[PDB]
Structure formats: structure tokens, C-alpha cells
Design a binder for this molecule. Structure first.
Ligand SMILES: CCCCCCCCCCCCCC(=O)SCCNC(=O)CCNC(=O)[C@H](O)C(C)(C)COP(=O)(O)OP(=O)(O)OC[C@H]1O[C@@H](n2cnc3c(N)ncnc32)[C@H](O)[C@@H]1OP(=O)(O)O
Ligand SMILES: COc1cc([C@H]2SCC(=O)N2Cc2ccccn2)ccc1O
Length: 402
């Protein structure tokens, strides 16, 4: 059984979620007034802390916790090493809610012991297309469309319990207190992803990896194999191919918004961004996010973005860090996607990245073979809290998780 997740308003089995035909809430309907104003009880040796994620020193403390105690691969060879500048960026988008950033500290020495963050996101999460077709067949269109409006919900990430406190049931308490703070803000859904299987994902996709520095990837034992031929296989132009590719600037915001919103529209689950959220999530930030538009005749017709997450290489001597670029949002209207993403690779490689990672969401599958991405061991499972949702393919997901 799941002593925690069984008590939660999520579908409980694969079986249950094959049964779901309409999008909609699961729990009893509640009001802010129904929600306790006191934080969830925790042991007297601990205290709740709300870090200030725009304070360098508080960001550094979260940083160290995640550097030492966040997500590893199944073989404990790699561990995410999210940068401080990246943490500020991911956790402080426009209209972020400081109270959604939730820590536990040892009351004695203020040692940071645990963390979970929520940020606001406006998400389209109405009944998916294949199920609206069935609803129409059965004269149930209105029930199917009832929750079509884009919803203001919580996106959770960065759940982390210090290694020294593992399997002590501290993660359920963090999730309950996060849930409480979010509910007190009159928000009743969340979206989150995990590499592990929990009850119960609405979508799952494989990760894909494109080697940019195979010598290094082999050396750290991420890849296997002659090195001259492997280098030759993965070699890339030294400069981008699309004439008038350039980094995004602030005046591109409205057109990038337009073409992104038009594109993400075609997917069942996807975010809606204001101009302020496009500027936050897509304007270039050194070491963090990198975004390039195609502009021809003073008009932005395509773009791509990727973000950086270095990983600690745990076992190797010769290297302590892996530099990885993650495919972020993009849109193509003037060139095949593979031609657009080729430039992403050239740019990533030119800037010193070792590998380009993505999950098979969006139309990421459409360029896998031609650009030489290979399937990895990772899977990313997508979940909602308090939201019934029919199983969809990952190529119907348009929400990139950081
Ligand atoms: C309305 C708004 C709602 C807001 C909240 C929305 C929900 C958000 C949900 C969180 C979204 C997070 C998205 C990400 O950030 S996914 C990345 C999570 N982080 C890591 O994997 C870092 C390395 N690992 C750790 O820090 C710990 O092992 C964690 C903290 C993950 C578990 O700590 P620990 O190992 O010390 O265990 P425990 O004894 O305290 O707790 C055991 C219980 O925890 C359940 N568990 C294990 N892994 C996960 C997991 N990734 N999501 C949710 N639950 C998980 C597990 O099944 C068990 O419950 P049950 O099986 O007994 O029933
Ligand atoms: C080792 O395989 C994977 C690792 C990961 C995550 S787990 C901790 C981490 O640092 N990963 C990122 C990573 C590590 C090595 C190569 C590419 N991506 C995601 C997808 C994968 O296929």
C-alpha cells in the first residue's frame, strides 16, 4: 500500500485512470475558510522556514541542500546540481507566492533539512481531444467541456529530504504543509512530475539524449563506444545554419508569445503565458536560459530555448561536473523543426555543453533520429494533484518541467 498517497485526492490505480473520461476535481469542494491557518504540526526539534528566494544567502542554503541531496540516477553516478541563479529564476516567476516555498530546519542549529517549492502556472487542463470526441458521440459534450477554462494552479518541484533524514515520513508532512499554503491561497490543483512511479500519472515519456562531447560522456560512463569515429559521428557545425538566428531581445516578447501560444494550443495539456511570463521564462540569462529567434525581414518566425542544469559526476576523478542543456519551449513556422533544433545543438555545443537532454513531449520525437538523439534510461511521469484526467500520450503534453 501507499500509507500517504492512499489518503490523497489522486487516482489510486492504473485501473481507475483508464476509467476517467472527463477532466475535473476529485476531492470534496472546499473554501479557504475550511483550511487551517496554523502550519501542520512537526516535531519540536524542527521548525518551518520560508526562505526568501530572492536573498542570495537563502538561495545558497537551498542550493547546497539540492547539490548534496537532490535527484540521482538509479546508479548513483550523477546528481543534479541546479545553480543558484537557476533556482532564483525557476522559483521567482511573475506573481510567485513567497509562502509556496517551504523548508524544514533543525530548530537548534538552523540546519536546512528539507524543501519543496510551488510556483503559479496557468494551465490548460480540460478534457483531452480523444475524449471530447467520445463525449460528443454519447451526447455528453457539456460535461466534457465544463473545465476547459485555463486554470491557475500550483506547479511543484524541488522536493528534497536530506540524506540523513530519509524514510522518516518527512516527505508526507512537507507535501501536506505545501498543500495547506497553496489551499489558503484558494488554489486546489497542482501539477508535478517525478522519475518514480506514484499513483497515478496521466502521461509518461522517455528521456532522450544527444551527445555533444562523446569523449567526456564515455569517460564518465554515461555512454559507451574508435573515439575518433564517435567524435566524427556526433560532430557539429561550428556556427548556426539559419541565417538571422540571433539571441532573443526584450522587443521580441510579443511575437514569441504569439507563435508559442499558437503552437502549444494544439496540445491537450499546456501552459498559457502572459508577456511578463514569456520575458521571465525565455529572455536569455547567463548560465541559466538561452533563447534564439529566427527573424527574417524584421519578423520573428521561429525560436528555440534551452536551459542549463549541470550534474555532479559522483564517481569519476577526471571530471566533477557534467554540463547538460535541456530542450525548453520552441516553435517553427518557416523551417522543419529538425532544422531549427540543429541550431540548438550547434549553439549548445559551441557554448561548451556536453549533452542535450529532453523528454519526448511536444513534437520532440519528430527530430530524434535525424539529430541523433538516443533514448535514455530516464522516464518522466506527469501527475496532477486533485484532478481526474484521462491517460494521454506524452506528445500531447506541452508543459516543460524545470
Ligand atoms: C493543491 C496543491 C497541492 C500541492 C502538493 C501537490 C503534491 C506534490 C507531491 C510531490 C511532488 C514532487 C515532485 C518532485 O520534486 S520529484 C523529485 C523528488 N526528489 C528527489 O527524488 C530527491 C532525492 N530524494 C529525496 O529527497 C527523498 O527520497 C524524497 C523527499 C523524494 C522522499 O523522501 P523519503 O525517501 O525520506 O521518504 P519519506 O519516508 O519522507 O516519505 C515516503 C513517502 O513519500 C512518497 N514519495 C517518494 N518519492 C516521492 C516523490 N518524488 N514525490 C511524491 N512522493 C514521493 C513515497 O511513495 C511515500 O509515500 P507512500 O508511498 O507511503 O504513500
Ligand atoms: C543516467 O540517465 C539519465 C539520468 C537523468 C538525471 S538523474 C540525475 C541526473 O543528473 N540526470 C541528468 C543526466 C545525467 C547524465 C547524463 C544526462 N543527464 C535523466 C535521464 C537519464 O536518461
Amino acid at each position: 500500500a501507499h500509507a500517504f498517497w492512499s489518503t490523497q485526492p489522486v487516482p489510486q490505480t492504473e485501473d481507475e485512470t483508464e476509467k476517467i473520461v472527463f477532466a475535473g476535481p476529485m476531492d470534496e469542494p472546499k473554501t479557504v475558510a475550511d483550511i487551517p491557518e496554523e502550519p501542520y504540526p512537526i516535531a519540536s526539534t524542527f521548525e518551518w522556514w520560508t526562505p526568501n528566494m530572492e536573498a542570495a544567502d537563502d538561495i545558497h542554503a537551498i542550493y547546497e541542500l539540492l547539490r548534496d541531496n537532490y535527484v540521482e540516477d538509479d546508479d548513483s553516478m550523477f546528481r543534479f546540481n541546479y545553480s543558484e541563479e537557476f533556482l532564483q529564476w525557476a522559483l521567482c516567476p511573475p506573481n510567485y507566492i513567497p509562502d509556496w516555498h517551504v523548508a524544514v530546519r533543525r530548530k537548534a542549529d538552523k540546519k536546512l533539512l528539507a524543501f519543496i517549492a510551488g510556483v503559479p502556472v496557468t494551465l490548460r487542463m480540460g478534457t483531452p481531444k480523444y475524449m471530447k470526441v467520445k463525449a460528443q458521440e454519447k451526447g455528453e459534450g457539456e460535461e466534457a467541456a465544463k473545465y476547459d477554462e485555463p486554470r491557475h494552479i500550483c506547479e511543484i518541484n524541488f522536493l528534497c529530504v536530506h540524506k540523513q533524514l530519509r524514510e522518516k515520513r518527512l516527505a508526507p508532512i512537507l507535501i501536506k504543509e505545501a498543500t495547506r499554503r497553496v489551499n489558503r491561497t484558494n488554489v486546489w490543483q497542482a501539477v508535478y512530475t517525478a522519475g518514480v512511479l506514484l499513483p497515478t500519472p496521466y502521461a509518461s515519456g522517455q528521456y532522450f539524449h544527444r551527445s555533444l562531447n562523446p569523449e567526456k560522456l564515455v569517460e564518465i560512463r554515461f555512454s559507451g563506444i574508435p573515439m575518433a569515429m564517435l567524435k566524427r559521428n556526433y560532430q557539429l557545425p561550428s556556427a548556426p545554419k539559419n541565417s538571422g538566428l540571433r539571441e532573443m531581445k526584450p522587443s521580441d516578447v510579443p511575437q514569441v508569445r504569439r507563435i508559442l501560444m499558437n503552437y502549444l494550443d494544439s496540445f491537450d495539456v499546456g501552459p498559457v503565458f502572459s508577456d511578463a511570463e514569456i520575458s521571465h521564462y525565455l529572455l536569455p540569462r547567463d548560465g541559466v536560459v538561452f533563447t534564439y529567434v529566427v527573424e527574417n525581414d524584421k519578423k520573428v518566425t521561429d525560436f528555440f530555448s534551452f536551459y542549463r542544469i549541470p550534474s555532479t559526476v559522483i564517481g569519476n576523478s577526471n571530471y566533477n561536473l557534467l554540463n547538460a542543456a535541456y530542450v525548453h519551449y520552441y516553435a517553427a513556422t518557416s523551417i522543419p523543426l529538425h532544422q531549427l533544433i540543429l541550431d540548438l545543438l550547434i549553439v549548445a555545443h559551441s557554448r561548451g555543453f556536453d549533452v542535450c537532454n529532453m523528454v519526448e513531449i511536444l513534437d520532440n520525437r519528430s527530430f530524434v533520429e535525424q539529430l541523433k538523439f538516443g533514448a535514455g534510461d530516464g522516464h518522466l511521469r506527469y501527475y496532477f494533484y486533485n484532478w481526474a484526467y484521462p491517460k494521454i500520450k506524452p506528445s500531447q503534453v506541452a508543459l516543460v518541467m524545470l
